[PDB]
């Protein structure tokens, strides 16, 4: 399944390396995180 290290984050989006980014997630992004 999808690997946390390869999750793509848009510019300005929240990420574990960008706590200030917007907490907005696309549909495909949310489905991507459905697997631990």
């Amino acid at each position: 399944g999808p690997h946390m290290s390869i999750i793509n984050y848009n510019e300005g989006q929240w990420s574990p390396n960008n706590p200030s980014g917007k907490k907005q997630y696309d549909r495909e992004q949310l489905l991507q995180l459905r697997e631990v």
């Binding site: 997630y25 696309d26 489905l31």
Partner: protein
């Protein structure tokens, strides 16, 4: 070690089970609240999809502290984008509801601050999915959410959008539509 992805809002899942021995409010059951993508999935993954819950039941996902009812102050001056479904399959039903939930928790709307929650009604004749917004008089926000809904959701020649003010549907227990997309 695993860092969860926080959502812009805290959301609460409600499940209504028809029970005439109780008032409608008391039919609402607060399940759990979540504020991360992972915790949403931990909830959704292990609850029945809409196609499997009892007839007469609802699922409602609303921002924390907003009850899924007209009386709540966040919904008094609001309305809902109603999506009457034309007897689609179970997967189409469930995928539509999930996509709605992902629109909500993912903050897909420009006027996401106007979003209060969403309700799916599982009924015998036809099922119904509604997105509740805060201010029905806010035409700019109602249309943006409406346009964004038919865009993020698969355009359906068969199913249309109907925006109904809560002030109206509350009186008529038959109900006028103030927008149509």
């Amino acid at each position: 070690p695993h860092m969860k992805h926080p959502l812009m809002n805290v959301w609460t899942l409600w499940y209504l089970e028809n029970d005439r021995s109780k008032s409608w409010e008391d039919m609402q059951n607060e399940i759990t609240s979540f504020d991360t993508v992972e915790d949403f999935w931990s909830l959704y993954n292990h609850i029945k999809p809409p196609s499997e819950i009892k007839l007469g039941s609802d699922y409602s996902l609303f921002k924390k502290n907003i009850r899924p009812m007209w009386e709540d102050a966040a919904n008094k001056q609001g309305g809902r984008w109603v999506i009457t479904l034309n007897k689609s399959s179970k997967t189409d039903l469930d995928n539509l509801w999930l996509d709605v939930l992902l629109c909500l928790i993912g903050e897909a709307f420009d006027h996401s601050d106007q979003i209060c929650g969403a309700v799916i009604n599982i009924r015998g004749k036809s099922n119904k999915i509604s997105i509740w917004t805060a201010d029905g008089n806010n035409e700019e926000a109602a249309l943006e959410i409406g346009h964004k809904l038919r865009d993020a959701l698969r355009l359906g020649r068969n199913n249309s959008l109907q925006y109904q003010l809560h002030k109206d549907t509350m009186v008529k227990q038959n109900v006028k539509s103030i927008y149509t997309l």
